[PDB]
Design an enzyme around this catalytic site. Structure first.
Site, PDB file in Angstrom:
ATOM      1  N   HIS A  58     -97.417 -53.795 -69.347  1.00  0.00           N
ATOM      2  CA  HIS A  58     -97.431 -52.593 -68.445  1.00  0.00           C
ATOM      3  C   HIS A  58     -96.114 -52.497 -67.721  1.00  0.00           C
ATOM      4  O   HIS A  58     -95.655 -51.359 -67.380  1.00  0.00           O
ATOM      5  CB  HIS A  58     -98.648 -52.388 -67.600  1.00  0.00           C
ATOM      6  CG  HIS A  58     -99.009 -53.519 -66.713  1.00  0.00           C
ATOM      7  ND1 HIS A  58     -99.949 -54.475 -67.091  1.00  0.00           N
ATOM      8  CD2 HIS A  58     -98.559 -53.850 -65.466  1.00  0.00           C
ATOM      9  CE1 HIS A  58    -100.042 -55.364 -66.058  1.00  0.00           C
ATOM     10  NE2 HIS A  58     -99.233 -54.986 -65.081  1.00  0.00           N
ATOM     11  N   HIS A  61     -90.765 -53.225 -56.917  1.00  0.00           N
ATOM     12  CA  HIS A  61     -91.715 -53.820 -55.972  1.00  0.00           C
ATOM     13  C   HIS A  61     -91.585 -55.346 -55.924  1.00  0.00           C
ATOM     14  O   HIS A  61     -91.763 -55.981 -57.048  1.00  0.00           O
ATOM     15  CB  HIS A  61     -93.178 -53.475 -56.248  1.00  0.00           C
ATOM     16  CG  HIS A  61     -93.486 -51.997 -56.220  1.00  0.00           C
ATOM     17  ND1 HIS A  61     -94.480 -51.443 -56.961  1.00  0.00           N
ATOM     18  CD2 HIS A  61     -92.925 -50.951 -55.535  1.00  0.00           C
ATOM     19  CE1 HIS A  61     -94.612 -50.135 -56.764  1.00  0.00           C
ATOM     20  NE2 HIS A  61     -93.668 -49.868 -55.850  1.00  0.00           N
ATOM     21  N   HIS A  84     -91.283 -56.474 -59.852  1.00  0.00           N
ATOM     22  CA  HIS A  84     -91.313 -55.672 -61.075  1.00  0.00           C
ATOM     23  C   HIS A  84     -90.890 -54.206 -60.746  1.00  0.00           C
ATOM     24  O   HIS A  84     -90.677 -53.889 -59.554  1.00  0.00           O
ATOM     25  CB  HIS A  84     -92.594 -55.679 -61.902  1.00  0.00           C
ATOM     26  CG  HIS A  84     -93.659 -55.193 -60.963  1.00  0.00           C
ATOM     27  ND1 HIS A  84     -94.193 -55.977 -59.964  1.00  0.00           N
ATOM     28  CD2 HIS A  84     -94.155 -53.951 -60.804  1.00  0.00           C
ATOM     29  CE1 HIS A  84     -95.066 -55.271 -59.291  1.00  0.00           C
ATOM     30  NE2 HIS A  84     -95.001 -54.062 -59.777  1.00  0.00           N
ATOM     31  N   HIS A  92     -91.212 -49.815 -61.859  1.00  0.00           N
ATOM     32  CA  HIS A  92     -91.968 -48.654 -62.382  1.00  0.00           C
ATOM     33  C   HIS A  92     -90.862 -47.627 -62.780  1.00  0.00           C
ATOM     34  O   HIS A  92     -89.972 -47.554 -61.913  1.00  0.00           O
ATOM     35  CB  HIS A  92     -92.961 -47.968 -61.408  1.00  0.00           C
ATOM     36  CG  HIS A  92     -94.047 -49.006 -61.092  1.00  0.00           C
ATOM     37  ND1 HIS A  92     -95.209 -49.087 -61.811  1.00  0.00           N
ATOM     38  CD2 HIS A  92     -94.060 -50.003 -60.174  1.00  0.00           C
ATOM     39  CE1 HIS A  92     -95.945 -50.074 -61.339  1.00  0.00           C
ATOM     40  NE2 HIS A  92     -95.227 -50.615 -60.400  1.00  0.00           N
ATOM     41  N   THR A 130    -101.729 -50.946 -59.492  1.00  0.00           N
ATOM     42  CA  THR A 130    -102.371 -51.095 -60.821  1.00  0.00           C
ATOM     43  C   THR A 130    -103.750 -51.767 -60.650  1.00  0.00           C
ATOM     44  O   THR A 130    -103.961 -52.519 -59.692  1.00  0.00           O
ATOM     45  CB  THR A 130    -101.517 -52.011 -61.805  1.00  0.00           C
ATOM     46  OG1 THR A 130    -101.238 -53.175 -60.920  1.00  0.00           O
ATOM     47  CG2 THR A 130    -100.212 -51.369 -62.273  1.00  0.00           C
TER      48      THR A 130
HETATM   49 ZN   LIG Z   1     -95.722 -52.059 -58.672  1.00  0.00          ZN
END
Ligand SMILES: [Zn+2]
Length: 258
Positions: free
Chosen positions: A62, A117, A92, A94, A197
């Site tokens: 993801h 993040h 990570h 996005h 998530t």
């Molecule tokens: Zn995130």
């Protein structure tokens, strides 16, 4: 089947397996700068990342996580709106399929190219798994990325993506300094939210920095080459792995600056 970002398993479908998807403190949200309340009782953030110890980079299907050793108080966040010490566990990103989208949070409805993040867990709970079960379990630092100049401290990350192209792949990733990813100013917005998530637990205190960092086109270009699929599967590029803004409901966004 299992959740992702496609038409059939996308964020609009998540409530079906994770009823909390429709909760009261869902993330992300749009930040309305005119409605955000300057809170002068808010303390300056404290980032101590000098003893950080990255271990690994992983494609989880993801996003890609850069994981840190959180066995001790090596890389911690405190101050701001927080009570206690929060240990960095992972960071990570996005990002979008185009430069006009990719961020999870929005500012006066403006979307950025990506959003970073930095994930921290409250040490009073002893492990990450116990922390997520708590209302004040996690502190996530949100940093917007805009396309402009290259960010030097992001190049090491960019360069290793070829090696973790597909889902389940991981690579050794030591001696990475997370300090290279910070904007110059630490002015932020704060509100109570959740994981963006699944399982979407309402356990986070979001800290969103006002100032974005710039990355080049070429830097974000490399993100877009990752795959959602595992090896030997039909190729599905890893893009648009962002959840849309959720209803603020009964919440107030506080600002650390005027
Ligand atoms: Zn995130």
């Amino acid at each position: 089947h299992h959740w992702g970002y496609g038409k059939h398993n996308g964020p609009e479908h998540w409530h079906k397996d994770f009823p909390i998807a429709k909760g009261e403190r869902q993330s992300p949200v749009d930040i309305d700068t005119h409605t955000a309340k300057y809170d002068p009782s808010l303390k300056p953030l404290s980032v101590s990342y000098d003893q950080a110890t990255s271990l690994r980079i992983l494609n989880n299907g993801h996003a890609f996580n850069v994981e840190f050793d959180d066995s001790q108080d090596k890389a911690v966040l405190k101050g701001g709106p927080l009570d206690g010490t929060y240990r960095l566990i992972q960071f990570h990103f996005h990002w979008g399929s185009l430069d006009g989208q990719g961020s999870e949070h929005t500012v006066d409805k403006k979307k950025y190219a990506a959003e970073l993040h930095l994930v921290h867990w409250n040490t009073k709970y002893g492990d990450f798994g116990k922390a997520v079960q708590q209302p004040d379990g996690l502190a996530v630092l949100g940093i917007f990325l805009k396309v402009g100049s290259a960010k030097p401290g992001l190049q090491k990350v960019v360069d290793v993506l070829d090696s973790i192209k597909t889902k389940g792949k991981s690579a050794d990733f030591t001696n990475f300094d997370p300090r290279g990813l910070l904007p110059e100013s630490l002015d932020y917005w704060t509100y109570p939210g959740s994981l963006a998530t699944p399982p979407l637990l309402e356990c986070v205190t979001w800290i969103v920095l006002k100032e974005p960092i710039s990355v080049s086109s070429e830097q974000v270009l490399k993100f877009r080459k990752l795959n959602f699929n595992g090896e030997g599967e039909p190729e599905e590029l890893m893009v648009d792995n962002w959840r849309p803004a959720q209803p603020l409901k009964n919440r107030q966004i506080k600002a650390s600056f005027k």
